[PDB]
Amino acid sequence: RLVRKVFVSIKGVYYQANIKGEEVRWLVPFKFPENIPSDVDFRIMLTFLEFYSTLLHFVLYKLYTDSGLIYPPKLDLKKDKIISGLS
């Protein structure tokens, strides 16, 4: 529940929240069965996926050690089977 700013415009949702110095701006789209550009390469973005994904992994590991917490958090099945969301 530490956040600062919210922006929205024609492209999705820009959430902005800070951690201890370095400060976060990021994005979520508006969900549709909207197709892929069918050109641009994933491979570059797939390895951005490998490394950056790992970053995210430990960052949330060492990040659940902030207080003390079980990394990654357990989920209840009914949650996802029904909701499948941040709930």
Partner: peptide
């Protein structure tokens, strides 16, 4: 805009369908 201030804007600018602040970007 609830968090663009921290005010909890009253329902006068709200309570649809009356106009709401159009966007008011953080920047």
């Amino acid at each position: 805009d609830c968090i663009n201030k921290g005010e909890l804007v009253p329902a006068n600018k709200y309570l649809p369908g009356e106009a709401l602040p159009p966007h008011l970007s953080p920047w």
